[PDB]
Design a protein around this ligand. Structure first.
Ligand SMILES: [Zn+2]
Ligand SMILES: [Zn+2]
Ligand SMILES: [Zn+2]
Ligand SMILES: [Zn+2]
Lengths: 113, 57, 1070, 46, 62, 55, 56, 51, 51
């Protein structure tokens, strides 16, 4: 029932018998993992594909026209924790502040003072 | 419309019989029947036609 | 008698009735009695019938005598567990095969004991109650507005009618007409207000006055005599006035029966002695009686139109056709066609015949499908009655039998009247929800007693018969009803009452009958009826010349040659139907009636135990009194979908699909009720070492992490069976099929897979490891060989050859497979806490506690806050103690166990008083800044494993008519791109992709005519020749690309004579 | 050496072929399983 | 349905311990687990929850 | 039933989220990828790779 | 939720508008990867204890 | 019942049927001095949390 | 041969778990490295079981 009930994704072949989708792209389809199933369609023309990537790419969909506001945020664990990590009381030492910077792929390669 | 549909043709004289892809048959291997629904009321009609004429001659 | 006592009473209950009482009890009632009364009524033919014989199971097959049959066989051979029927016919005789009910009376099982059964291969634990038609186990489903009762309804401002009273009538035994009585009341609450009523077969309506004179009452005031019972009630009487004027034109019984259109007058009578309020009796000399009713009715009407009595409550539950009854209304329909069949042989003999196949085959049809009403050009029946008994789990089967239906916003509701008789939680989500009810543990259905032994017992203890009544000499005369008939009134009743009630308690008027005294209206209800749900209660009676008390005492208890039959034959317990319930006062806790427990707030009866208002489903749910009710309702469904053991004989069963959990486990916490659900011996799951925490972030959104390591040690592994089956069809014209290992040989008609794993008998051996598509069976037709379902594979587990009634070769094959839990399979606890696997880590990777102990499962803390299911949290704690203490942890409903208590017990053992434990992150070993709710919780492994769903297609089997793909993943189908999916793409402005209905489905090249825009063209694609004679063309022709479904749309329209011309150029412009 | 079909109760190795009836060397009970294979089956310990 | 060799949860063997347990009950009339050496609940629950069906299965004929 | 909407290079199974997949990705089971194809015309830019994929 | 939810002021709503579909789409994974990882180590749970009220 | 088993090397990674471990205790700094934890509690951590 | 009420692979599992000796386990080779088609004394231990 949404323009977002269908979105174009980058394919990632992986093992195990299941479609593995990102969490933040959860509420658009409105799915959960208690058994929910998903349909997948495969473009076939060179343009068909393009039409799928230039207008239906998940990134283009982030701001929903129905309520002129985004429609995908940070859910559960990531949200809940992002809160903790923020409090003035939350401190991290070098050993971890490093393994943390490493996980950010775009990291400039510079540890902040 | 005098060209495409004249009042009279709302009554049928000669009946258009649709072909197989329309009323396909489904055989159970080889030596077993299997005929579509329409491929019957065509025959039911056909038979109700035969007898009629054989009462008018 | 304390609380812990009432349990032995309940134990006492099932020791004697057993979970499926209802089904059996109601069956025997059809065989034993009913069946007779049915054959003996409108029998005798211008040749009569007498007693009928009902033998035990038999198998009349050509090439053998008549083998005395048994359950477990008919099962394997797909037969029919039915026996013969004989009738002492008068001028001994065979008439049909009746399908018996397993575990009943004619079913040999009814006697055999423990050891006795193990030999018949029949699992002891199977409580039976089902039929076995053509193989598969069929379960008759209970079919639930009562009859013969007066109702008054107000009819909307827009209507010529003000109010109206109705009464649906039908003979409780004999044909059973479905014609209702309408006692209307024209003239809205203003206009200058008549009363007319509707009769069966009469075109228009008649003004009540005439209905009376036509009855046998000719003068006014003698008419008002019947309607109103108080000459000083001018209002009501006033109302009647205008009515009297209506009929003032017909002054006697002659004309009375006339105006109802010598020929006509005679028919008038008829519709009054056989159609008019036909219950009561359709005899003759009772005109009087019906008159007092039509009077009691016209009364009830006004009693409301004058704001003294509300409009009748349509959903007052107090106002179930089990198996036994169903066969009844069914049999009749049959035997009656046999009756008038035997009439034709007798109408040809110008000087054996009884085809006892209409009662055998007729019965089978119904029971087989689920369509009661015959067959023929009569689909105008009901499908559902009789289904395919569940066998996923034990608690699944129980549930299925204790099920109720209800032909189609208010009914679905959980009414008050539902207390005790039906389970509040167990009921299907979506679609039909509330139209399908399950019985509580204690509930039972009435069966059908006799009226007279109580009609008599009455008009000889104070019941001055209705026949001769005088409203004024007998003012406040308490009127009495019997099964909906008015058998006279009674003077001082207070005693008539506490005499019948003393009569039942000694057991001289079946404990099943209902007697309700409504002082607040002065009436006496008598019910023998068949289909009244009732529950049992302790009797209170202030019978204590030593105080203020339950008739039952701690001496009766410890005394439990003392069944439940005695607990009733001593007036210590009573069977209260929903109606009688209305006039009693029930005490909850027998006894009673701390800053931890739940705050707790004339008696005639006490509650055996509140935790008995639950049915099979909830009975397995721990602390259902601690979760959000809507959740309990869910688990109420998932249970019927977990794994376990559905019987023990399973190893000798040839049923398609069946799953057994490698290693079961009775729960660490249980319901006292489970004890009767044999649950401890047939668990639906295992006790997993849960751990509610966040980790990799793979236990997110109801997906759970499962410890691979222990998945290997066999945790939650399950066997999977399957049984493909085939026959060797023949023809009265000796042309038989074959079971061989075919190849070549002039035909080709063969499969793709291999036949090599086929010994020459056309079968595999039980050792063979089959897979992909490998031909499992080999049959031929002078190929008809069976292939292992494409998604499957495993190993053959048991092959078997056998005869058919028709001496044909019957062969079923069973394949086994061990199914391992995988990163996707679904699981769940007993709290609607369903979730699937997201990943699987091992011991190292797993988070842990100093002790070593590590979780088997890691569910997310997020599935708790809004689900509200807390009992879940409790079962864990409790079970973490029962784990350490070895003592069984009770989770049972409303008891005296608290969170504060258990927590103290857990502190005695060593761990945090709340469960939480320290844990060190399996990757680094550093402690977790937080603590976790680590504790053993029961988890059911619901069916629904990924690899049974995963499906992908690209150009596969195409349909025939349409030419589009085919449906379903099993037949290699393709997912539909239905409307809604269309829409979206259109929203995206994804023009081309959507257009790309063609490439992924239909598409097709048709050849149109440039002139008559049709698909005529005879395009012989080679020699180019195109043509289209009739339009005689070979020059102007076009080719187009449209969805074959559409090409078809057109061919179709044409054969209906409409002409869809297809033109390649616009001529109309714009 | 050798076996064809067995009986559901009195597990007594039988052996037949077309038309030779489908019963047992006694018990009428016309069931019968098709005894294991000769070719050994190999399993994995996981 | 037979006893489970080794506990799922931690791994400690537990096949042998079946008869020892089902015995320390019938006779010594007894805690049993504790002496059988089954400490932490993971393995504890293993034994204390097994419902030996095999027995009933064994009651079947051929 | 057949025109305004038909069954159609498609697949469907069970979802479970993965916290290590770019927002726009979608992990597809090898099994499925080995089933669904894509008609790519031979071109002197991809001949080399295609002749490999084909072998 | 207020600063990183599917909300109006939403840091997301802003990063989309200011940087583009792409940049913002990546933003998720990062904010994620860092946090999810962190949580993996700081741990978090819930138990009956979270639902009990003070003695008085 | 006739079998014939073949045993092989292998490890717990390949399968649990290998690892000879089976539960292992691990603790450090029982008195939270390093503060690698934040004790949950209703009133007193120390009294409510087993030493 | 196997007339037990347990299935083939159910027992198969069982034996996978039965603990075998592994003292001089280090002076044996992984079937994967041993140059023998399938197995042998130099990399495996065969067992019998009749009941
Ligand atoms: Zn033309
Ligand atoms: Zn035999
Ligand atoms: Zn353990
Ligand atoms: Zn070797």
């Amino acid at each position: 029932l949404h323009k977002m009930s269908m979105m174009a994704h980058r394919v990632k072949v992986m093992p195990y018998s299941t479609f593995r989708l990102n969490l933040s792209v959860t509420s658009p389809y409105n799915a959960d993992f208690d058994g929910d199933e998903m349909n997948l369609h495969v473009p076939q023309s060179e343009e068909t594909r393009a039409e799928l990537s230039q207008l239906c790419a998940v990134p283009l969909q982030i701001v929903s026209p129905q309520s002129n506001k985004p429609v995908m945020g940070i859910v559960q664990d990531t949200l809940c924790g992002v809160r903790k990590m923020t409090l003035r009381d939350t401190f991290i030492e070098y050993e971890q502040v490093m393994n943390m910077l490493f996980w950010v792929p775009s990291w400039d390669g510079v540890v902040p003072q | 419309n005098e060209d495409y549909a004249r009042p009279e043709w709302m009554i049928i004289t000669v009946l258009p019989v649709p072909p197989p892809q329309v009323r396909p048959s489904i055989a159970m291997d080889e030596t077993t029947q299997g005929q579509d629904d329409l491929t019957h009321k065509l025959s039911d009609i056909l038979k109700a036609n035969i007898n009629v004429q054989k009462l008018e001659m | 008698i304390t609380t812990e006592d009432c349990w032995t009473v309940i134990s006492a209950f099932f020791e004697e009735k057993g979970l499926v009482s209802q089904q059996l009890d109601s069956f025997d009632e059809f065989m034993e009695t009913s069946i007779q009364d049915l054959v003996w009524e409108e029998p005798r033919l211008i040749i009569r019938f007498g007693k009928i014989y009902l033998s035990r199971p038999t198998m009349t097959e050509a090439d053998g005598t008549t083998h005395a049959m048994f359950p477990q066989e008919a099962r394997l051979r797909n037969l029919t567990y039915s026996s013969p029927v004989y009738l002492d016919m008068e001028k001994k005789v065979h008439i049909g095969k009746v399908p018996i009910m397993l575990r009943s009376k004619f079913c040999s099982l009814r006697t055999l004991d423990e050891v006795d059964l193990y030999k018949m291969k029949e699992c002891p634990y199977d409580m039976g109650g089902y039929f076995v038609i053509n193989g598969s186990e069929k379960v008759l489903i209970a079919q639930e507005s009562a009859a013969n009762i007066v109702q008054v309804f107000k009819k909307a401002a827009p209507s010529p009618i003000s109010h109206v009273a109705e009464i649906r009538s039908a003979l409780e035994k004999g044909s059973r007409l479905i014609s209702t009585m309408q006692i209307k009341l024209y003239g809205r609450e203003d206009k200058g207000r008549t009363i007319k009523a509707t009769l069966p077969y009469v075109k228009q309506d008649i003004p009540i006055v005439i209905v009376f004179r036509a009855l046998g009452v000719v003068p006014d005031g003698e008419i008002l005599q019947h309607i109103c019972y108080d000459e000083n009630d001018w209002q009501m009487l006033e109302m009647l006035k205008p009515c009297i004027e209506e009929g003032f034109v017909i002054q006697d019984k002659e004309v009375a029966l006339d105006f109802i259109g010598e020929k006509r007058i005679q028919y008038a009578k008829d519709i009054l002695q056989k159609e008019l309020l036909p219950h009561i009796t359709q005899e003759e000399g009772f005109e009087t009686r019906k008159t007092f009713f039509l009077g009691y009715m016209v009364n009830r009407l006004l009693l409301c139109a004058l704001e003294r009595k509300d409009q009748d409550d349509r959903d007052h539950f107090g106002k179930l056709d089990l198996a036994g009854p169903l066969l009844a209304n069914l049999f009749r329909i049959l035997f009656r066609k046999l009756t008038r069949e035997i009439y034709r042989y007798m109408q040809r003999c110008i000087e054996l015949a009884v085809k006892s196949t209409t009662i055998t085959s007729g019965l089978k049809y119904s029971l087989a499908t689920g369509n009661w009403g015959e067959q023929k050009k009569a689909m105008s029946s009901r499908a559902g009655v009789s289904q395919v008994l569940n066998r996923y789990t034990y608690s699944s089967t129980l549930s299925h039998l204790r099920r109720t239906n209800t032909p189609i916003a208010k009914p679905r509701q959980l009414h008050n009247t539902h207390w005790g008789l039906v389970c509040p939680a167990e009921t299907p989500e979506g679609q039909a929800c509330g139209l399908v009810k399950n019985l509580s543990l204690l509930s039972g259905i009435s069966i059908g007693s006799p009226s007279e032994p109580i009609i008599n017992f009455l008009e000889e203890w104070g019941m001055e018969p209705l026949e001769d009544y005088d409203p004024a000499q007998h003012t406040k005369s308490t009127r009495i009803f019997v099964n909906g008939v008015w058998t006279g009134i009674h003077r001082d009743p207070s005693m008539l009452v506490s005499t019948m009630r003393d009569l039942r308690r000694s057991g001289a008027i079946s404990p099943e009958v209902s007697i309700i005294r409504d002082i607040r209206e002065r009436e006496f209800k008598i019910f023998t009826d068949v289909g009244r749900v009732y529950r049992p209660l302790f009797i209170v009676e202030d019978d204590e010349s030593k105080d203020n008390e339950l008739r039952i005492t701690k001496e009766h208890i410890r005394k439990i040659v003392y069944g439940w039959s005695s607990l009733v034959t001593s007036g210590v317990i009573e069977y209260v139907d929903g109606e009688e319930e209305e006039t009693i006062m029930i005490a909850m806790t027998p006894e009673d009636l701390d800053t931890a427990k739940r705050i707790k707030p004339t008696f005639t009866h006490c509650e055996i135990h509140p935790s008995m208002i639950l049915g099979v489903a909830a009975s397995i749910i721990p602390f259902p009194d601690h979760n959000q009710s809507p959740r309990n309702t869910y688990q109420s469904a998932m249970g019927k979908q977990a794994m376990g053991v559905f019987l023990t004989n399973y190893n000798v069963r040839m049923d398609t699909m069946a799953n057994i959990l490698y290693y079961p486990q009775k729960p660490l916490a249980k319901t006292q009720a489970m004890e009767y659900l044999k649950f401890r011996e047939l668990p639906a799951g295992q006790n997993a070492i849960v751990a509610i925490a966040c980790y990799s972030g793979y236990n997110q959104e109801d997906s759970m992490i499962m410890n691979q390591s222990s998945i290997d040690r066999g945790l939650f592994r399950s066997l999977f069976f399957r049984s493909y089956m085939d026959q060797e069809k023949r023809f009265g014209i000796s042309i038989v099929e074959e079971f061989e290992k075919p190849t070549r040989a002039t035909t080709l008609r063969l499969k793709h897979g291999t036949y090599e794993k086929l010994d020459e008998d056309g079968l595999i051996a039980p050792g063979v490891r089959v897979s992909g598509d490998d031909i499992i069976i080999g049959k031929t037709t002078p190929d008809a060989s069976t292939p292992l379902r494409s998604t499957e594979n495993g190993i053959v587990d048991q092959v078997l050859l056998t005869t058919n009634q028709e001496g044909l070769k019957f062969v079923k094959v069973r394949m086994r497979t061990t199914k391992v839990p995988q990163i996707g399979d679904k699981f769940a606890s007993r709290h609607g806490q369903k979730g699937t696997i997201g990943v699987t880590y091992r011991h190292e990777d797993m988070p842990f506690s100093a002790e070593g102990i590590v979780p088997d499962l890691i569910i997310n803390p997020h599935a708790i806050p809004s689900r509200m299911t807390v009992a879940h949290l409790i079962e864990c704690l409790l079970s973490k103690v029962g784990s350490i203490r070895g003592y069984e942890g009770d989770a049972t409903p409303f008891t005296d166990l608290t969170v504060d208590a258990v927590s103290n017990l857990l502190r005695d053992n060593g761990y945090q008083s709340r469960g939480f434990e320290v844990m060190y992150n399996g990757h680094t070993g550093k402690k977790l800044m937080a603590q976790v709710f680590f504790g053993p919780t029961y988890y059911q492994r619901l069916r629904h494993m990924v690899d049974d769903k995963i499906h992908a297609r690209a150009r596969g089997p195409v349909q025939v008519l349409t030419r589009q793909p085919v449906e379903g993943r099993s037949r290699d189908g393709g997912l539909r791109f239905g409307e809604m999916e269309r829409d979206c793409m259109i929203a995206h402005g994804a023009a081309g992709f959507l257009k790309e209905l063609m490439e992924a489905s239909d598409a097709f090249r048709v050849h149109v005519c440039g002139i008559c825009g049709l698909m005529s063209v005879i395009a012989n694609l080679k020699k180019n020749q195109f043509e289209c004679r009739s339009c005689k063309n070979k020059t102007n022709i076009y080719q187009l690309h449209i969805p074959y479904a559409a090409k078809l749309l057109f061919q179709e329209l044409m054969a209906m004579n409409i002409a869809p011309r297809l033109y390649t150029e616009r001529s109309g412009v714009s | 050496y050798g076996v064809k079909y067995t009986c559901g109760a009195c597990a007594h190795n039988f052996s037949l072929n077309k038309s030779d009836p489908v019963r047992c060397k006694e018990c009428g009970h016309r069931v019968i399983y098709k005894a294991r294979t000769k070719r050994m089956s190999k399993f994995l310990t996981t | 349905m037979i006893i489970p060799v080794r506990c799922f949860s931690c791994g400690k063997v537990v096949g042998d311990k079946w008869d020892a347990y089902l015995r320390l009950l019938e006779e010594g009339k007894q805690d049993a687990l504790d002496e059988l050496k089954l400490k932490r609940y993971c393995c504890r629950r293993m034994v204390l929850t097994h419902v030996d069906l095999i027995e009933k299965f064994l009651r079947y004929n051929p | 039933g057949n025109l305004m909407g038909k069954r159609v290079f498609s697949a469907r199974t069970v979802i479970s989220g993965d916290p290590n997949l770019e927002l726009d990705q979608v992990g597809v089971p090898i099994s499925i990828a080995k089933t669904l194809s894509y008609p790519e015309t031979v071109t002197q830019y991809n001949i080399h790779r295609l002749t490999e994929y084909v072998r | 939720k207020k600063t990183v939810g599917s909300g109006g002021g939403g840091l997301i709503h802003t990063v989309m508008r200011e940087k583009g579909p792409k940049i913002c789409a990546e933003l998720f994974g990062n904010i994620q990867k860092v946090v999810n990882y962190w949580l993996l180590h700081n741990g978090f749970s819930i138990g009956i204890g979270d639902a009990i009220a003070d003695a008085s | 019942l006739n079998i014939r088993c073949i045993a092989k090397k292998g490890i717990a990674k390949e399968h649990a049927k290998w690892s000879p471990c089976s539960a292992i205790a691990f603790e450090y700094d029982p008195h939270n001095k390093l503060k690698h934890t934040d004790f949950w509690f209703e009133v007193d951590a120390k009294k409510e949390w087993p030493d | 041969m196997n007339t037990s009420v347990l299935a083939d692979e159910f027992i198969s599992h069982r034996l996978g778990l039965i603990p075998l000796v592994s003292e001089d386990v280090e002076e044996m080779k992984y079937s994967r490295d041993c140059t023998c088609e399938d197995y042998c004394d130099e990399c495996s231990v065969v067992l019998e079981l009749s009941a």
